[PDB]
Design a protein around this ligand. Sequence first.
Ligand SMILES: N[C@@H](Cc1c[nH]c[nH+]1)C(=O)O
Ligand SMILES: N[C@@H](Cc1c[nH]c[nH+]1)C(=O)O
Ligand SMILES: N[C@@H](Cc1c[nH]c[nH+]1)C(=O)O
Ligand SMILES: N[C@@H](Cc1c[nH]c[nH+]1)C(=O)O
Ligand SMILES: N[C@@H](Cc1c[nH]c[nH+]1)C(=O)O
Ligand SMILES: N[C@@H](Cc1c[nH]c[nH+]1)C(=O)O
Ligand SMILES: [Cl-]
Ligand SMILES: [Cl-]
Ligand SMILES: [Cl-]
Ligand SMILES: [Cl-]
Ligand SMILES: [Cl-]
Ligand SMILES: [Cl-]
Ligand SMILES: [Cl-]
Ligand SMILES: [Cl-]
Ligand SMILES: [Cl-]
Ligand SMILES: [Cl-]
Ligand SMILES: [Cl-]
Ligand SMILES: [Cl-]
Ligand SMILES: [Cl-]
Ligand SMILES: [Cl-]
Ligand SMILES: [Cl-]
Ligand SMILES: [Cl-]
Ligand SMILES: [Cl-]
Ligand SMILES: [Cl-]
Ligand SMILES: [Cl-]
Ligand SMILES: [Cl-]
Ligand SMILES: [Cl-]
Ligand SMILES: [Cl-]
Ligand SMILES: [Cl-]
Ligand SMILES: [Cl-]
Ligand SMILES: [Cl-]
Ligand SMILES: [Cl-]
Ligand SMILES: [Cl-]
Ligand SMILES: [Mg+2]
Ligand SMILES: [Mg+2]
Ligand SMILES: [Mg+2]
Ligand SMILES: [Mg+2]
Ligand SMILES: [Mg+2]
Ligand SMILES: [Mg+2]
Ligand SMILES: [Mg+2]
Ligand SMILES: [Mg+2]
Ligand SMILES: [Mg+2]
Ligand SMILES: [Mg+2]
Ligand SMILES: [Mg+2]
Ligand SMILES: [Mg+2]
Ligand SMILES: [Mg+2]
Ligand SMILES: [Mg+2]
Ligand SMILES: [Mg+2]
Ligand SMILES: [Mg+2]
Ligand SMILES: [Mg+2]
Ligand SMILES: [Mg+2]
Ligand SMILES: [Mg+2]
Ligand SMILES: [Mg+2]
Ligand SMILES: [Mg+2]
Ligand SMILES: [Mg+2]
Ligand SMILES: [Mg+2]
Ligand SMILES: [Mg+2]
Ligand SMILES: [Mg+2]
Ligand SMILES: [Mg+2]
Ligand SMILES: [Mg+2]
Lengths: 289, 289, 289, 288, 288, 288
Amino acid sequence: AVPKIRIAVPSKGRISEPAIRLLENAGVGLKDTVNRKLFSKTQHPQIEVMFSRAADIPEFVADGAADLGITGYDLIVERGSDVEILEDLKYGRASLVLAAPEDSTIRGPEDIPRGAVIATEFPGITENYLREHGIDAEVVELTGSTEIAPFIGVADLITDLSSTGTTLRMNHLRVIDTILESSVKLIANRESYATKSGIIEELRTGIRGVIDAEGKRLVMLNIDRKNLDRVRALMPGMTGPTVSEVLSDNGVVAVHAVVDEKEVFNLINRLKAVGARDILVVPIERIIP
Amino acid sequence: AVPKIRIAVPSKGRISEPAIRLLENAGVGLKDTVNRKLFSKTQHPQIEVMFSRAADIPEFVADGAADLGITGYDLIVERGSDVEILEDLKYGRASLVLAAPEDSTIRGPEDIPRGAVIATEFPGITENYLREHGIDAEVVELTGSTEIAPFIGVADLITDLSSTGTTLRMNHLRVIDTILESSVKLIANRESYATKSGIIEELRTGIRGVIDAEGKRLVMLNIDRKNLDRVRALMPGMTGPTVSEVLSDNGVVAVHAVVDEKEVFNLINRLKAVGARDILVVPIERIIP
Amino acid sequence: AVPKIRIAVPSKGRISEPAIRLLENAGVGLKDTVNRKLFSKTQHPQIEVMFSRAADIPEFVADGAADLGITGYDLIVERGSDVEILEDLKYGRASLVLAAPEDSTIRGPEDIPRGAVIATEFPGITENYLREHGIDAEVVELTGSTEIAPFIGVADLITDLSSTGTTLRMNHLRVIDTILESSVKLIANRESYATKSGIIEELRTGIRGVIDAEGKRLVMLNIDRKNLDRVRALMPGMTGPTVSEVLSDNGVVAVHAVVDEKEVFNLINRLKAVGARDILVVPIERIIP
Amino acid sequence: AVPKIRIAVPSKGRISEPAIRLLENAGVGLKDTVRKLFSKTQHPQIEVMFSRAADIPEFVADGAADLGITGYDLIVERGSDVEILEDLKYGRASLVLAAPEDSTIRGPEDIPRGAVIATEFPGITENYLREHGIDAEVVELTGSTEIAPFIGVADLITDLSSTGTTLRMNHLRVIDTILESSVKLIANRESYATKSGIIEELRTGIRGVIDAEGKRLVMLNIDRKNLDRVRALMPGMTGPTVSEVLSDNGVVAVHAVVDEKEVFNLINRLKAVGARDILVVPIERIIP
Amino acid sequence: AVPKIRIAVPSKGRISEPAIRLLENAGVGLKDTVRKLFSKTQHPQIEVMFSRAADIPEFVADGAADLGITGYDLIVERGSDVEILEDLKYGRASLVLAAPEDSTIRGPEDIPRGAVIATEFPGITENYLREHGIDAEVVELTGSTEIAPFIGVADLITDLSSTGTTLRMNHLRVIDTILESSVKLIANRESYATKSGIIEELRTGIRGVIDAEGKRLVMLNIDRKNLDRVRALMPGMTGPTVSEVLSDNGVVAVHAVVDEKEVFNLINRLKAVGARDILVVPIERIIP
Amino acid sequence: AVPKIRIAVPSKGRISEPAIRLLENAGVGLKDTVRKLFSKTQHPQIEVMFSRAADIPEFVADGAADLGITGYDLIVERGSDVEILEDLKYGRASLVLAAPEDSTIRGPEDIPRGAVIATEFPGITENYLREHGIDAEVVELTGSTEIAPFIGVADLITDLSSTGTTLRMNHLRVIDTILESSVKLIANRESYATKSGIIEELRTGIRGVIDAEGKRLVMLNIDRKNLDRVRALMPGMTGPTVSEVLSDNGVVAVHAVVDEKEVFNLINRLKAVGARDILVVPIERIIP
Ligand SMILES: N[C@@H](Cc1c[nH]c[nH+]1)C(=O)O
Ligand SMILES: N[C@@H](Cc1c[nH]c[nH+]1)C(=O)O
Ligand SMILES: N[C@@H](Cc1c[nH]c[nH+]1)C(=O)O
Ligand SMILES: N[C@@H](Cc1c[nH]c[nH+]1)C(=O)O
Ligand SMILES: N[C@@H](Cc1c[nH]c[nH+]1)C(=O)O
Ligand SMILES: N[C@@H](Cc1c[nH]c[nH+]1)C(=O)O
Ligand SMILES: [Cl-]
Ligand SMILES: [Cl-]
Ligand SMILES: [Cl-]
Ligand SMILES: [Cl-]
Ligand SMILES: [Cl-]
Ligand SMILES: [Cl-]
Ligand SMILES: [Cl-]
Ligand SMILES: [Cl-]
Ligand SMILES: [Cl-]
Ligand SMILES: [Cl-]
Ligand SMILES: [Cl-]
Ligand SMILES: [Cl-]
Ligand SMILES: [Cl-]
Ligand SMILES: [Cl-]
Ligand SMILES: [Cl-]
Ligand SMILES: [Cl-]
Ligand SMILES: [Cl-]
Ligand SMILES: [Cl-]
Ligand SMILES: [Cl-]
Ligand SMILES: [Cl-]
Ligand SMILES: [Cl-]
Ligand SMILES: [Cl-]
Ligand SMILES: [Cl-]
Ligand SMILES: [Cl-]
Ligand SMILES: [Cl-]
Ligand SMILES: [Cl-]
Ligand SMILES: [Cl-]
Ligand SMILES: [Mg+2]
Ligand SMILES: [Mg+2]
Ligand SMILES: [Mg+2]
Ligand SMILES: [Mg+2]
Ligand SMILES: [Mg+2]
Ligand SMILES: [Mg+2]
Ligand SMILES: [Mg+2]
Ligand SMILES: [Mg+2]
Ligand SMILES: [Mg+2]
Ligand SMILES: [Mg+2]
Ligand SMILES: [Mg+2]
Ligand SMILES: [Mg+2]
Ligand SMILES: [Mg+2]
Ligand SMILES: [Mg+2]
Ligand SMILES: [Mg+2]
Ligand SMILES: [Mg+2]
Ligand SMILES: [Mg+2]
Ligand SMILES: [Mg+2]
Ligand SMILES: [Mg+2]
Ligand SMILES: [Mg+2]
Ligand SMILES: [Mg+2]
Ligand SMILES: [Mg+2]
Ligand SMILES: [Mg+2]
Ligand SMILES: [Mg+2]
Ligand SMILES: [Mg+2]
Ligand SMILES: [Mg+2]
Ligand SMILES: [Mg+2]
């Protein structure tokens, strides 16, 4: 009769909570989720959530155990899983870098000698990076804590996943190359997409809408009509500022416009200097241009 | 002089966090909550919160240790506590079902023989269900994990609490009846209500308001005036769409209406096809019709 | 070229999460925060977050390891750290009280004898309180659980941090004085402020804006024009209610005003009695008057 | 052919780790546990089922487990038809009836009609009022009965203590003892009559461990001329064991079973009589 | 001068605490651990590096650790060039191939072309299909292979069990055994040829502990006139030890090494022959 | 009548479980603990109060606890007026003064005026600068002093290590040792003069455990004709114990106290001299 979809959402780690929050904002929040449950209903009667570990999501989606998944690009690439990437989700960004003991000769990938050992949690991506750059080096897979590998003599070099070079400087390591830029993606099974594109695009519009709302707020203010002109030039908004009557002693209007977070501080000072008062910043859940 | 109320809120489990979020949205968020504290102030000077385990809340409220409580209907029924139910809170929904090993003869309650053993966490509800259906069966109370009871030979049948039949299919069990539909309730002591109805109805209005806001968003768009008519028919809203001037090159208006989440996706496509742009979905915390 | 700032934010305890939420609401939410990271980027390219324990934040800020910090006033005072207080953050309020075994002679600080022992987690503040009140009493520093100290014979009196006297009454203790009122503060290094005041005031405006939004919501309603006058007197708002056209059968207008949470319940009943319908309470993230 | 037995063991709480340690000491330790739900042991005929202690009385009576290890309080609360085989001499606790210290009630006889008692053991409590002829309500809590008076849920509580210190902190006074609890080894009656051999083998091991508690083997070197005075000082189970030591003098080695209670005084006595090199060596099991 | 050795020990999982207990029993316990990443032991020449069990085979082969303690399954999965020194007789588990119970597949020979097997050991599995000549896909999971058929990720799973009970719960049937696992003590080849003395010293300690498992010293008092029948009843490692007891009769004390398996029957035999005061005393290490 | 004593024991950290194990080995283990705040022990006259290790020095000096078990570093930091009774030979750690590896400072004498030292032991540090005559600031942190230079909070740190490995990871170099720490048994002076009997009884038990560390009872079977060479090979505490074995030849059993350090060499010696069936049996306590 009517098709259901299952979306694979990380159960633990950094990706998990923001993925739950995004679905919530997309109108597809978790519904009546009992604990000890691997599956959960959502606010949409045709969408369920499967809690899966993040490294398994590429495969679950490739195989069709889940129609859609939310996971990291690094994991998708490492598995080499056969999946369609639908959207970049603009969170969970991290670089898989190649790093060396700061006192090392090696200052760039050109310096890596035949016998060099590299410790990694991502042997697939790392072998591939080495193969593409033609470097002959050995790759040792570790469970974690690659940062310790030079210290204990397992490796000359490491790979590592970071937003800030800080955990690297702390272990006295220097980035000598970036192997991969990673971000969280919404992915899809191909067979699922061809047969269930309505509901899929429905969730995709909801999610895509939340992403376009990022760093966008609705700014409202009361202005005396004599200054309404300078407020136009300051708040162009999406098509133009929305202007409404205010019941007061002066000819006061209320002006609303969607504004980006990059612009709000300079705008506030520019608005106040023109006679704007009662400046409100109201949240926007979804934008569809 | 002036009356204080104490509301019992679950401390752990699935009910806990959403109850805290609901009070927050009702204007009664937790205020300055020190850890290791069994009590907490709220944003309202006359409302305090007592952190109680969910199964104890019916009794705390029945006895008057708490004026009000937020807990599950199953727990209220199981205890048979003497309390007034004020509101259904529309979350934490779950069915207490009667289930059998999938390969069993028993396909419905009619098939249960004299000597049948049923394992449960809810002996009260279960005895009562059996008594009302006239079935002679034995009831064994377990601490948890009733799903394992047939496997280890303790029981022929089990009861279980689920939103999805998934944890049941996983243990190879089939639902042969639904015993009780459960949902989270706001409850009240009777003596508390008669003597403190002002503040109680105040919290009740706040909470009731958050529940009516569920699946309701405020949708805003910019439309060229030539198409303002088709937007009326698409966005009836609560009384009618709110229309405001936009300062642009064309006669553009801005149109706002409260819309239900069931309708937003079809609405978006219907709006875009009519010339609507810059579609915003803004959250609504409380609705009072 | 351009200056970066580092803000010290508590990593564990009651202060932590609300501090993260406040920055989020200020437009400076945590960005791409990898776990096991002591530092994190934020939504602002010039602002980073250092996760620090709350008692260490005064010193980190005094010394310049962090430009700014969010921590409790009690901790700032106890350390006696040299820092500039920028804003009170209006959460995490607690009183450091002096308390005695309820059956004790001591009913006020005047009754404390020469040899009296006071157990505390705040010896600095406590010595200082004693020194200012001229009382000769001994101060014993404990790791925690000062509430047990009279019971085991370590102390006659204790200090304690509470929003509610409940944890004190439970251990059968009575407050005999308040030593210090504590609240969460935004603080700053002096050298950081003189050299990086632009970006600092930018974050300060963002944060200050979120604090002024507390207990303030945007209330919207549909009213028939014949009753628009009584709605003026009920919703003065910031300058005056914003009034917009509604496309319906009657001359209906829509009226919006910023209202304080203290007034919403009485307002709702007053609005309904005048013919107001479809009352919406919409959240406001930031107010800049 | 070969009867196998299942023993229900607590999976969490304070009964768990000591019960597991008890089986280990009895020669039937957890073998290659992948803790879990079912574990193998050193004995081919014995398997452990990890269970919630409150459920163990039921699992045993219904036959899902041949044997169990759980608290007497839980056995009585369930009302489960099980055979108590052995007292395990640990997890002792009294289920007491308690009143607020500022209460007039000092004993069962002071409890007025309609008093409310908060408890985790509603079956035990209702029965206690019916054996004593007291007309009072019973209210069941998940835990923290200590806090019920303070919040106004009950006038009285029951609680489970071995030291009255939790009660003393929360300003509560013991007015009676309802039941004395200790961890028991229990048996399914049908399992016993059909598998007595293997049950008795584990029973003996388990009983041997309990009978070794606080017992030590004391060993010392002494010159031959003082051997007569050691004799009196430590009688042991039957008498002290003697062996020749190879050294310069006529040194002998003397060993005996001694109780912890005796050891300090005994050491002093032995030292004053010329004994040196005194060893205390553990005994896992004793069978008299 | 003085060679020092590093032994990689699992920092979490079920291999961890028993390995640490094993070193303690071998006279090389963790000393003043501030557990950590590197710890001192009772032996000046020995230091522990806490490591993830999956990494230990690599740390050992590459030379970052002279010795390790990790599962055979992990050693084979890594394919690490290490020397297995000793079997440690714990953490036994079979890596089995399993099918849904409602599956037609009962054996390796029933596996149809293109069947999908979910596993945590993709190297072991791929090799198993290549030693048996089976054309099937392999899919690697982080864990919970038991759930893969139910969700439709695979037709078959591998799993690691000592009791088939997890499999029985999730309605799965064992169709073959791929590998039998046990915890091993492993060595770097270069470390052995250069530090054999200290390695063999720890090896002996460790081997002595394993050879003591399930062995006890049984001790009893008996009258001299029955000493002949004890002899037959417990042969011990060579024969029972006898010493004079000081009491009233002609009482002697008799001691022997006995296996746990024997102890119950033996106790009965000894009791029927007049032996009393029977003690079971632990043995930490045995070296024949 | 009957004096009772309270002993403050750490409730968490690395001092906790070994202290509890120490009391158990001393014949005064935790009895029926419902861990808690107050526990009973095997001794009627002894009760345990679980406490934070940092508070134990105060609880003892002020008299809330007669005895305690806590780190020397914490005792000195408090400046608490307590009697140290016994060294407990575990939880050893040095409080070191450390500099960034890329620092010019190699010793105390290199520390320039106004240098900032981050520490968890501000009392110990301030005193160290005043015993050495160094003009430097002290900044107190909750923990993670290792990270203070990297973030720019201090030029120097103090830290508490037994292996310099945490320091080596965070690129820090030890420049001096401020204090050497070990876990102590401490006493209230007033408690000692009034309850010396019971205190000394626990002291002896506790001291007996520490003196047993690394000591074992070695036992072996040998033919009578080789008994002379065993004598030389293991002198024991006074000399080896000998008993007749019942077998076919003239076999005797020989036992002695031996140190862990000796055991490997000794085993080899005994094997070469014809000794077989070598047992290592634990000793809980030794009193010379
Ligand atoms: N007219 C304003 C606000 C708005 C957008 N859409 C609806 N209203 C803008 O274009 O930015
Ligand atoms: N006039 C719109 C929006 C609104 C409701 N209330 C206030 N404004 C509607 O009725 O849906
Ligand atoms: N005019 C309304 C709402 C508003 C404030 N600022 C912009 N709009 C008020 O002053 O309360
Ligand atoms: N003969 C000693 C030791 C012993 C008991 N049983 C066997 N040996 C005693 O009776 O105490
Ligand atoms: N002589 C006894 C005990 C023993 C073994 N080795 C040393 N002593 C036996 O052979 O079993
Ligand atoms: N006689 C042996 C064993 C022993 C010590 N003390 C008592 N027995 C030795 O001196 O080493
Ligand atoms: Cl990596
Ligand atoms: Cl980087
Ligand atoms: Cl990308
Ligand atoms: Cl579809
Ligand atoms: Cl149930
Ligand atoms: Cl269902
Ligand atoms: Cl309902
Ligand atoms: Cl009221
Ligand atoms: Cl305090
Ligand atoms: Cl207060
Ligand atoms: Cl203040
Ligand atoms: Cl600046
Ligand atoms: Cl339980
Ligand atoms: Cl109770
Ligand atoms: Cl209950
Ligand atoms: Cl009492
Ligand atoms: Cl049998
Ligand atoms: Cl691992
Ligand atoms: Cl597997
Ligand atoms: Cl993987
Ligand atoms: Cl099977
Ligand atoms: Cl060597
Ligand atoms: Cl501490
Ligand atoms: Cl330190
Ligand atoms: Cl501090
Ligand atoms: Cl160093
Ligand atoms: Cl005494
Ligand atoms: Mg939702
Ligand atoms: Mg493709
Ligand atoms: Mg990393
Ligand atoms: Mg590159
Ligand atoms: Mg709030
Ligand atoms: Mg009613
Ligand atoms: Mg359930
Ligand atoms: Mg029905
Ligand atoms: Mg953010
Ligand atoms: Mg200043
Ligand atoms: Mg406090
Ligand atoms: Mg005052
Ligand atoms: Mg336990
Ligand atoms: Mg369990
Ligand atoms: Mg349990
Ligand atoms: Mg009642
Ligand atoms: Mg209790
Ligand atoms: Mg382990
Ligand atoms: Mg590890
Ligand atoms: Mg591990
Ligand atoms: Mg595949
Ligand atoms: Mg598994
Ligand atoms: Mg510890
Ligand atoms: Mg503690
Ligand atoms: Mg502690
Ligand atoms: Mg300073
Ligand atoms: Mg440190």
